Write a protein that binds this ligand. Structure first.
Ligand code: BEF
Ligand SMILES: [Mg+2]
Length: 1015
C-alpha cells in the first residue's frame, strides 16, 4: 500500500478487503501476518564481548603496541640463552596492558548500556482493534496488528501503526506529533484525501503515524503500514543506513600513531645503516647475511624500546576518569573517545521541540482589567515563572510576588480556566514527573490554576499525587458542570454551562481565540463590576493581544469571558453550529492568558556560554518558521530586533538554493524550520563538508539520522529510544548546561592528554638514546630491559596518571575550538621532547661513566679501559684482577637508574603546563602530582632496600654523596626545560624560597670529568 493518504476511504478499504464496521476475519489476520510480519521495530544486539574487543583493538596505537609485543616475543624466542624467564617478561606484560585496557573500555560500553536502558519508558504497548470474532472492542497487543485492521483511538492513547482515518466520532481529532514531525502544537486531523503524493508528514492530515499520542477526541482508522514500513520504521532504516565515522580524538591519535611509526622506522633504518661496514666482520662468521641479520635484530630491539608501553593505558584511564566525571552530573557517555568530542566541537545543531524547549506548554502571561475612565483602561498584567507541568511556579506582577484573593477578577479567571476544560494533570509515582492527561493547552490552564492559589487553601501537608488537582478540585466542587458547548471550526471558542452548587445563577464560561470572544462580548468585568463595553477599551485590549502574539515573545492567546444571564437549557438546542453562534451573545470579558512551549531555563545561559567559547548554535526543527524564530529570539540565538531575512530558512527555501547560496546559508544561517529528517542529515553533512565538528542534539525520532550523522549526538533523557540509540551521549536529567560542562571537560582532557603523551614519549626516547650512546662508545651497559619495564610502568605510569589531573587553563572557555587540521604533536614539540630525551640519555650514560672514572671510592678507570669493556685480559691494566670483577658492579647501574628516575620526576613536574613556567605555576595546585612523585620515591627506596628486589634488579643502596651527585646530574633538566618553555612562550615566592636552599645545598662541590676522547 503506497501513498494511502492520496486515496479515499473506499479505495483503501477495497484494497484491503475489510469492512468498516466488522473488521478483519481471523483467516485474513494470519494471512496478513505471514505476508507483512509483525508490528515490532527490530532490536539487534550484535555487540558481543568478542566483537567489542576486536573493534576496540582497531586503534592504531594498540596495533603498534601489539606489533612491538609480537616482535619482542619472536626476538626473545631466538636469543639462544638460558634467561628466558625474564627476556619474555617484557612482551607478555605489554599483552596484559593491551588486554586489560580492553575490558575497561568494554566495561564502559556495558555501563552506558546499563544506564541508558534504565531511563527507558516501559509500558505494555496495547491496541484497540475490531475483528469479526466478536463485535465489541478487542484490546490486543500492538505487535499482533496487521495492515488492514480497523483501529479505534481515544484520548490519551498511543497509536500503534500507520493508520488512514476512516471516521471521526468526536467531531474533532487532535494529535500530538512532536515525536515525529517536531510540531509543538497538536494538529487537527480530517478524513478528506490529500491530493499530493510527495506530501510531507506535517500536511498528511488524514494519516496517523505510530508513536504519536492522541491529544483529544476519538476516531476510527484502518492500518495501512506496519512494522518497519511505518514512518518511524523508515526513519530507523535511514538511521541504520547512515555511516558512522571515527571521533576526532581517535583521528588525532591515529595520526600520532602514524608519526610514531614513521619515527620508529627511521630510527631502525638509521641504526642499521650506521653499521653497514661491520656486516662482513669475522666475529659473525665472515658472511654478508648473518652479520646483517644480527645488526637488524639489534636495530629492531632498539626501535621496539622507543614505543611507550603504558601510553594507551594512561589514555584510557584519563578518558574513563572524564567519563565518570560526566556521569556524576547526569551525562551517560557510551564510548570513551567521545568524551573529548564536544571540546573540539565548532557547531552545535539543536532541536526546538522537546530539546531546546520543555515540550510542556505552560501559561506565561495573563491580564485583566483594574479601572476604566474613558476610551481607555488600566490593565493588570501578571507573569508566571513555571515552564514544566509541575504546579510549583508563582504569579508575579511588576516582578514582585502577588496574592490572588485581592484580585477578584483573578479568581474569576481561575474559575473560568479550571471549569472550561476537560483535561487534567496527573503525577506518575514511577516516572516522578507531572504530566498531562488530554490537551496540552488545557493542561497548561490547569497547572496555572494550581499555581495561583486563588482560594488560599492549605497545601503544605498535601502529597504530590494529590497536589496535581487541589485548587481545580475545590473550585469544581463549588460549581457543578451541567454541560459543555463543544468547540467549533467556524467559531474559535468553546463554552461550559455551570451552576452554583450552593442553593440561592447558572453562569456560562467561554474561552477561545481573542477576536471572536471580544466581538461577541458587550460587557467588561472590572473587579466585581459589569461595565458596558467601550471602543477604547476594546482597542487597548487588541493592542496588548497583538503585541503578545506578534513580538519575539510569540504566544498563543486565549480570551476568557463569562455570560452572566444565559438562556436556560430548554431554549438552547445542542444540535447545530449556528445555534452555538447565537447562544454566545452579550458576553462579559473577564481576562486573557498567553502560553507557549517554553525553553528550558538553562538554555539561554548555555547558548551564550557556547558563543563565548567559539561555538555557534544552529536550530534545526520540523516546526513552522514563526515559532522557531520566536524561540531563537527568546533563547538568544537571535536578537529581539535582529533581521533574519538571510539567517532563517525553511526546507523548501533551502531546496532550490544555489550551491554558493547553500554554502553561505550553512555558514551564516542559525535557524532551519520545516525540515524532514533527511533534510536535517543533509544540513549536518553540509556543515561537516566545511571541516567543522558538528554536535547534534535532539530527542525525537526525526533527529535520529542527524544524531547519527554528527560526530557526537546528544539525546535528551526524555527523548525516544531510537534517538538515544543514535546518540553517543544522553542527558539523564535533561540539563542543557551539561553541554558546556562536557565541552570544558573535553578541552581539559585534551590538554592533559597532550601533556602526558609528551612526557611518556620523551621518557622512552631518552631511554633509547641512552642505550644507543652506551652501544656506540662501548661502555658497559647501564640499563637492562627489566629495569626499563619497571621505570616505564610504575615510575612513568604514576606521574602520567597524576598529570591527567592537571588544573584547567584559566582562559579555557574564552578561546575558539582548536583547528581540526593541526596535529596532536607539532614540529616544535617534536624538537622539544627530543631535547629532554637526548639529555636523559647523555645524563644517564655520564652518570654510569662517572662511577668508573671520577667517583671517590670507586676505581679511577681511564676512558680507554672503560671503552674496552670486553677487553678485560692481560692487556696492560693496572688492577687487572680488580677491574674484571668491577666492570659488572651494580653501582653504575644504580647510578643510571636513579638518575633516570629523578630526571623523569623532574620532567613530570615540568609537565604541569604546556608553555607556562613552573615558577608561576607551582606543583602545589596539582597535589595529585606531588603525591604520585612521593609514592614513586617511596617505592623506589623500597626496591632499593628489601631482600629480593636488589637481586631481581641489579641495584644496591647508595651513599649521601652519591645521591648528591645524582641530584646534581638530574637538576639541570629543570633549567633546560624552563629555557625551552620560555623560548616557546616568547616566540610562587614560597616555591622559590623552598627551592633555593635545595639548589644551593646540592651544588656546594663539583667533580671534574677526566675524559677528552670520543669514538
Ligand atoms: F523536535 Be524538533 F523541533 F524536530
Ligand atoms: Mg524534538
Amino acid at each position: 500500500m503506497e501513498n494511502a493518504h492520496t486515496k479515499t476511504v473506499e479505495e483503501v478499504l477495497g484494497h484491503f478487503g475489510v469492512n468498516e464496521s466488522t473488521g478483519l476475519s481471523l483467516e485474513q489476520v494470519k494471512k496478513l501476518k505471514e505476508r507483512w510480519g509483525s508490528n515490532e521495530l527490530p532490536a539487534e544486539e550484535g555487540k558481543t564481548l568478542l566483537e567489542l574487543v576486536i573493534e576496540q583493538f582497531e586503534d592504531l596505537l594498540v596495533r603498534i603496541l601489539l606489533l612491538a609485543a609480537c616482535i619482542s616475543f619472536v626476538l626473545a624466542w631466538f636469543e639462544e640463552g638460558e634467561e628466558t624467564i625474564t627476556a619474555f617478561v617484557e612482551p607478555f606484560v605489554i599483552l596484559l596492558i593491551l588486554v586489560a585496557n580492553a575490558i575497561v573500555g568494554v566495561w564502559q560500553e556495558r555501563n552506558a548500556e546499563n544506564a541508558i536502558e534504565a531511563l527507558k519508558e516501559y509500558e505494555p504497548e496495547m491496541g484497540k482493534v475490531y475483528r469479526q470474532d466478536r463485535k465489541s472492542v478487542q484490546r490486543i497487543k500492538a505487535k499482533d496488528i496487521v495492515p488492514g485492521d480497523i483501529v479505534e483511538i481515544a484520548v490519551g492513547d498511543k497509536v500503534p501503526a500507520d493508520i488512514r482515518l476512516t471516521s471521526i466520532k468526536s467531531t474533532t481529532l487532535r494529535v500530538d506529533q512532536s515525536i515525529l514531525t517536531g510540531e509543538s502544537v497538536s494538529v487537527i486531523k480530517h478524513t478528506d484525501p490529500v491530493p499530493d503524493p510527495r506530501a510531507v508528514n506535517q500536511d498528511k492530515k488524514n494519516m496517523l503515524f505510530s508513536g504519536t499520542n492522541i491529544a483529544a477526541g476519538k476516531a476510527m482508522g484502518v492500518v495501512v503500514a506496519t512494522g518497519v514500513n511505518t514512518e518511524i520504521g523508515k526513519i530507523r532504516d535511514e538511521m541504520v543506513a547512515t555511516e558512522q565515522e571515527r571521533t576526532p580524538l581517535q583521528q588525532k591519535l591515529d595520526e600520532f600513531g602514524e608519526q610514531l611509526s614513521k619515527v620508529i622506522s627511521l630510527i631502525c633504518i638509521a641504526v642499521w645503516i650506521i653499521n653497514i661496514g661491520h656486516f662482513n666482520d669475522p666475529v659473525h662468521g665472515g658472511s654478508w647475511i648473518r652479520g646483517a641479520i644480527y645488526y637488524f635484530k639489534i636495530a629492531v630491539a632498539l626501535a621496539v624500546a622507543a614505543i611507550p608501553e603504558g601510553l594507551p593505558a594512561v589514555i584510557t584511564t584519563c578518558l574513563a576518569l572524564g567519563t565518570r566525571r560526566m556521569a556524576k552530573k547526569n551525562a551517560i557517555v557510551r564510548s570513551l573517545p567521545s568524551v573529548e568530542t564536544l571540546g573540539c566541537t565548532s557547531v552545535i545543531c539543536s532541536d526546538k521541540t522537546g530539546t531546546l524547549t520543555t515540550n510542556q506548554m505552560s501559561v506565561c502571561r495573563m491580564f485583566i482589567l483594574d479601572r476604566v475612565e474613558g476610551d481607555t483602561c488600566s490593565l493588570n498584567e501578571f507573569t508566571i515563572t513555571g515552564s514544566t507541568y509541575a504546579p510549583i511556579g508563582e504569579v508575579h506582577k511588576d516582578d514582585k510576588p502577588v496574592n490572588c484573593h485581592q484580585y477578584d477578577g483573578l479568581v474569576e479567571l481561575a474559575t473560568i480556566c479550571a471549569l472550561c476544560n476537560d483535561s487534567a494533570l496527573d503525577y506518575n509515582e514511577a516516572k516522578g514527573v507531572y504530566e498531562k492527561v488530554g490537551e496540552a493547552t488545557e493542561t497548561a490552564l490547569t497547572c496555572l490554576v494550581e499555581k495561583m492559589n486563588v482560594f488560599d487553601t492549605e497545601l503544605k501537608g498535601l502529597s504530590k499525587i494529590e497536589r496535581a488537582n487541589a485548587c481545580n478540585s475545590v473550585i469544581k466542587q463549588l460549581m457543578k458542570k451541567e454541560f459543555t458547548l463543544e468547540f467549533s471550526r467556524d467559531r474559535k471558542s468553546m463554552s461550559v454551562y455551570c451552576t452554583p452548587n450552593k442553593p440561592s445563577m447558572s453562569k456560562m464560561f467561554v474561552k477561545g481565540a481573542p477576536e471572536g470572544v471580544i466581538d461577541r462580548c458587550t460587557h467588561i468585568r472590572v473587579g466585581s463590576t459589569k461595565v458596558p463595553m467601550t471602543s477604547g477599551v476594546k482597542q487597548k485590549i487588541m493592542s496588548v493581544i497583538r503585541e503578545w502574539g506578534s513580538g519575539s515573545d510569540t504566544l498563543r492567546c486565549l480570551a476568557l469571558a463569562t455570560h452572566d444571564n444565559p438562556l436556560r437549557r430548554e431554549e438552547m438546542h445542542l444540535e447545530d453550529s449556528a445555534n452555538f453562534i447565537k447562544y454566545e451573545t452579550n458576553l462579559t470579558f473577564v481576562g486573557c492568558v498567553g502560553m507557549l512551549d517554553p525553553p528550558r531555563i538553562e538554555v539561554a545561559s548555555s547558548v551564550k556560554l557556547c558563543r563565548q567559547a567559539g561555538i555557534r548554535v544552529i536550530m534545526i526543527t520540523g516546526d513552522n518558521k514563526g515559532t522557531a524564530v520566536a524561540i531563537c529570539r527568546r533563547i538568544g540565538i537571535f536578537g529581539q530586533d535582529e533581521d533574519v531575512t538571510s539567517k532563517a530558512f525553511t526546507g523548501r527555501e533551502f531546496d532550490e538554493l544555489n550551491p554558493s547560496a547553500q554554502r553561505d546559508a550553512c555558514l551564516n544561517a542559525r535557524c532551519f524550520a520545516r525540515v524532514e529528517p533527511s533534510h536535517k542529515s543533509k544540513i549536518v553533512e553540509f556543515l561537516q563538508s566545511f571541516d567543522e565538528i558538528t554536535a547534534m542534539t535532539g530527542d525525537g525520532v526525526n533527529d535520529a539520522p542527524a544524531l547519527k550523522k554528527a560526530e557526537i549526538g546528544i539525546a535528551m533523557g526524555s527523548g525516544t529510544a531510537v534517538a538515544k540509540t543514535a546518540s553517543e551521549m544522553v542527558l539523564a536529567d535533561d540539563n542543557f548546561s551539561t553541554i558546556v560542562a562536557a565541552v570544558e571537560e573535553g578541552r581539559a582532557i585534551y590538554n592533559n592528554m597532550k601533556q602526558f603523551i609528551r612526557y611518556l614519549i620523551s621518557s622512552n626516547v631518552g631511554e633509547v638514546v641512552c642505550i644507543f650512546l652506551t652501544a656506540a662508545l662501548g661502555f658497559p651497559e647501564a640499563l637492562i630491559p627489566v629495569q626499563l619495564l619497571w621505570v616505564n610502568l610504575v615510575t612513568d605510569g604514576l606521574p602520567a596518571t597524576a598529570l591527567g589531573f592537571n588544573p584547567p587553563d584559566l582562559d579555557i572557555m574564552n578561546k575558539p575550538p582548536r583547528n581540526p587540521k593541526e596535529p596532536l604533536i607539532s614540529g616544535w614539540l617534536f624538537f622539544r621532547y627530543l631535547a629532554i630525551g637526548c639529555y636523559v640519555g647523555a645524563a644517564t650514560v655520564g652518570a654510569a661513566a662517572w662511577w668508573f672514572i671520577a667517583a671517590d671510592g670507586g676505581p679511577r678507570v681511564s676512558f680507554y679501559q672503560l671503552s674496552h669493556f670486553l677487553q678485560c685480559k692481560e692487556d696492560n691494566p693496572d688492577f687487572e684482577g680488580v677491574d674484571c670483577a668491577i666492570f659488572e658492579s651494580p653501582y653504575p647501574m644504580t647510578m643510571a637508574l636513579s638518575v633516570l628516575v629523578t630526571i623523569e620526576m623532574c620532567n613530570a613536574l615540568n609537565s604541569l603546563s604546556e608553555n607556562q613556567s613552573l615558577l608561576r605555576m607551582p606543583p602545589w595546585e596539582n597535589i595529585w602530582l606531588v603525591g604520585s612523585i612521593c609514592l614513586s620515591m617511596s617505592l623506589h627506596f623500597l626496591i632499593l632496600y628489601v631482600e629480593p628486589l636488589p637481586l631481581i634488579f641489579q641495584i644496591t643502596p647508595l651513599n649521601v654523596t652519591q645521591w648528591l651527585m645524582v641530584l646534581k646530574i638530574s637538576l639541570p633538566v629543570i633549567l633546560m626545560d624552563e629555557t625551552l618553555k620560555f623560548v616557546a612562550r616568547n616566540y610562587s615566592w614560597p616555591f622559590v624560597l623552598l627551592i633555593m636552599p635545595l639548589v644551593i645545598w646540592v651544588y656546594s662541590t663539583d667533580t671534574n670529568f677526566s675524559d677528552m676522547f670520543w669514538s
